[PDB]
Amino acid sequence: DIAGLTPCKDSKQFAKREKQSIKKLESSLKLYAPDSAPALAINATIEKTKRRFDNYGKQGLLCGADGLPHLIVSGDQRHWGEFITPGILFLYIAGWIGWVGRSYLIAIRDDKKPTQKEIIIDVPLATGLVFRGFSWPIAAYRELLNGELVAKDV
Amino acid sequence: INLPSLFVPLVGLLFPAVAMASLFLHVEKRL
Amino acid sequence: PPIGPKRGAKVKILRQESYWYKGTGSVVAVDQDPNTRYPVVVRFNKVNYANVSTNNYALDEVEEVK
Amino acid sequence: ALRFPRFSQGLAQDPTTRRIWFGIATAHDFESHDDITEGRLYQNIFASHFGQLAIIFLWTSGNLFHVAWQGNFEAWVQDPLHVRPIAHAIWDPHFGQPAVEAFTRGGALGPVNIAYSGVYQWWYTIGLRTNEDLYTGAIFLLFLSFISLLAGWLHLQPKWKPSVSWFKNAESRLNHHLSGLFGVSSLAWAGHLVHVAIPGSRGEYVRWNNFLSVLPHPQGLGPLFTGQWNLYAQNPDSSNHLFSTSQGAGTAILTLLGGFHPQTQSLWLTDMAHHHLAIAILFLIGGHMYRTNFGIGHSIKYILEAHIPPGGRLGRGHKGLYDTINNSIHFQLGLALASLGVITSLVAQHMYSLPAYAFIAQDFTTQAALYTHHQYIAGFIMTGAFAHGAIFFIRDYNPEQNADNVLARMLEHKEAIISHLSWASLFLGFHTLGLYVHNDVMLAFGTPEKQILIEPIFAQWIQSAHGKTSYGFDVLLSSTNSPALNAGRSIWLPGWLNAINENSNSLFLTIGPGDFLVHHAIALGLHTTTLILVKGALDARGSKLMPDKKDFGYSFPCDGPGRGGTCDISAWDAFYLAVFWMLNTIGWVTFYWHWKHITLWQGNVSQFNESSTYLMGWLRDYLWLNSSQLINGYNPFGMNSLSVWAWMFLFGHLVWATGFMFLISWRGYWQELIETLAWAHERTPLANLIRWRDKPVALSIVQARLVGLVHFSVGYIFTYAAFLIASTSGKFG
């Protein structure tokens, strides 16, 4: 496949690592009582590990000679779920945060003592402002086009 | 006769001694 | 006929060794006396590294801006 | 005057020991010396260059003499792969009997040192075979250094000293250096390779006494002037060819194969001679560009001033740059250091992947030592280039003569440059450290499969584009019908593809996620060091915190505690802080190189692949793991040949640590301590009869920073050199 890697579902070292992990987890389980709280916790962890490995095989991740999943970020459409749509999600959230904070700073910049509203957050105004980050992708775009995103005269 | 035996002391003891003495005299006195 | 910008005006600094260089301040008072080369007094809303918000400037160093 | 230093009258009147210190640390800063003029400065620089050439020749002559005298060359050439080359003998009266026993190696009659500079392979490849050749080379070089000193002295004397107008003749100097220093020199090297080295690698021993009686080619110079040059490549050396013997030898003197010599695992000598001849032709042609006394050619300043884009995006373009470069010597030194550092790093990168000396690829410790050597020197050269750029800004820059050209516009938007470079550094550091810590925590919880392993897919694609076929990308050279592949199938691609796809050499190593992460660490280091240096340079002339910095010189302690405090505000201090980052970045580079190569030499590249993704792997599987023989160099049960490194390993740990002293404790404490010490000495019997002559004082602030940095760097270098050499030589694999 890409970069000489093979799918984890049909890879062999991936399955070997899965088996070894479960064996290691089970080794501890046999020491305690069959149905004690530690035994239940260890069983839950084993089930979690099995579910994790099955999901990794299901999503179609690529596994190297090491038997571990590898992430392709070149832009291949078969792997957009590895970096590109999480990347878009991060960009949206981070722009939300930055736009909300900038809106707060611009809103409080007109008082005689703006610093007072900076060490003591004016929550009433902040609660109204935080929701602009839902549509910041549009507000920032029209802010740039309208030419007042960037401070002229500087 | 062993050439290293003559020179290693010459360059490690005599040379630094004479050089340090001469340079101390040069640096440390009014001209 | 007073000299320099009027009191309460809006001037930007042109002295390149000033903290507020290219910045903006409000004119406080311009001395009518000649023989003084830094008559204009300007107040800023930000302190400098010495925690000072007022400074004197020459007539050519300040420039009335909108 | 009237005492040391004579070049500074202000220092000679200092009544403290400072006069001595600053007397030594400003001897080569001619511009700040009393009664300094233009011609005086240039003549002093010229003579110092002659002195440096003499020193270099003397040093290489000493290497030759010692290898010829206590060396192993005659025995080494008999079996290059199964005998350790000897540098020089040891004569230390402090040695004990077991030390003498342990240090006698290489078939010597006493304790000796095993050379790791790689001079044996280099001298063997070029044609030197016996100790007589080494002795002749040493004598010739001693003569050469003497002649260099004679030239320096001659040009010191009046009536031979060039004027300033001569020094500033850039066009003629460029013409001669391109067509003469570079072109003719490479042409001569190609001549030597054709006349001596290539015959030497085929059995014949061509020397001064018979090189006029031996034809380098059976049809000498007939093909060359007739134009039928292909006759010089008609019979290359067979792939079953032992190096210094005629078994399987050819007659071609120039070729272009591209692979390696199968036995020596190094580049073909004929290919190298052809390379040097070609680039000699290119340099000779290109060195006729500028105008001198013959009425044809170019004037550099006109080319510069004519390169101004319409639309004024670059302002006045390069107008006025010729005069600011020709008159500013620090500008010239900065440009030279920049280019030199770039090509030194290039040498480091190319020497390990395309070895040119026979049997050096099989000498692993030599390869590692040379790579680390050249990388550290390149880092120092780059840091120096930036330092001298800042110095030029402070001293030789004329704002009015550079009005609105590229330099002034660089100065006037310095803040955008610095801020964006800071953003790049922040991004790289944040995400590289985040991924490393994530993987490390993942392995802490026993779930390696949940790591964020990103395939360096772009680099793998580039490798595939070169012809490698381990990633299945099927790109140029790795495809089958691509024009790029088809164009060179009959020249060099056979050998090149044979070498690149061969996976026992270092020609384009296979790469994975660990390589991705470490390369991004490298990028972080480069960007942060560049940030520190660029910020120090562009703000050298002054900033908002100190607008009149240009009047305070390049290096000064501070501006006092006023205005919030102005510690480390000079450009010298910016260089000072950048040296730490340079050391750190080159340390990462060499750690990566050495770990990858030590795991490849063991046929255990997997181990690196697994353990490189997380930092605990670096700490345990590399530093802790490869450091057992070194620390065991000597123990309560005796010592072995590695003890000298084990000692140095500790020595480098001490120096570095004492460096932390001058960097943390500052002047005032030490000054008061020295004051009480002076009182005590003056108040004691029999010793007050002895009186100091320079008043003791604590080290200066700038001097203390410099001494601390020097300790830091010396300890860094010594400890890493000890570790690298002991670990690679401990296994010899």
Place this chain on the structure above:
Amino acid sequence: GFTPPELDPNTPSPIFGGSTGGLLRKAQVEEFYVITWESPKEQIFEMPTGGAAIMREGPNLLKLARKEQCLALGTRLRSKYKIKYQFYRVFPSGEVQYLHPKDGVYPEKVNPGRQGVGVNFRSIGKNVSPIEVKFTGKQPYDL
């Protein structure tokens, strides 16, 4: 123009028990400083070098090894005790040099009998760059 007071030996020195912070060889071969004041009443003050000393009634004379020490002592005498002081520089040759207050009035108060030294009639931002004063003995600020 204010004849400076002449140093008067025989004046009593303050009561002090001795210290390791006193004079050294520099006073013997180079120079040392002497400060004098009046102090209306006997009282205990903090020495600039060691512990505490007591000022005698009437004139007091103290010899220090540094001018900065004399100034610190004078500042404490002027602000804490409200005493007028003057100090001198004494050379091994036997010379005395009135130092402070130079013209009878302390340097803080403007006096009509002082000339300007090292005063530049321009803002600090109008100094030439180093390149204009290169290879000349002058510095850009000395102009």
Place this chain on the structure above:
Amino acid sequence: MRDLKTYLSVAPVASTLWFAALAGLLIEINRFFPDALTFPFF
């Protein structure tokens, strides 16, 4: 009450409450969908 609100919105207190809420939200998201290395929904 009014002064309690004022002090309860000062930088340190507001920041700690915000980060406690964010930590809880992220913890719950991880708990419901643990061991997530990719975005599979689309």
Place this chain on the structure above:
Amino acid sequence: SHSVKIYDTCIGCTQCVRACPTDVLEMIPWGGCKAKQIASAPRTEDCVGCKRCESACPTDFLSVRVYLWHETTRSMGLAY
């Protein structure tokens, strides 16, 4: 001996003179401001380079500038 310069932006506030710990600065008659005062540096040979004067100057940039220069036993503040 360090070099101390007074620039014409001085407003004669006198704060630098109060700060000097070696009596290097002074106040002299002048006519370009309201105080008719300006700082002078007639005794820079006793300057120790502490730059305590610059920390007291309220003008921006400074009106009193200390340029550290050749060091003497007086400038180094040595009592031995």
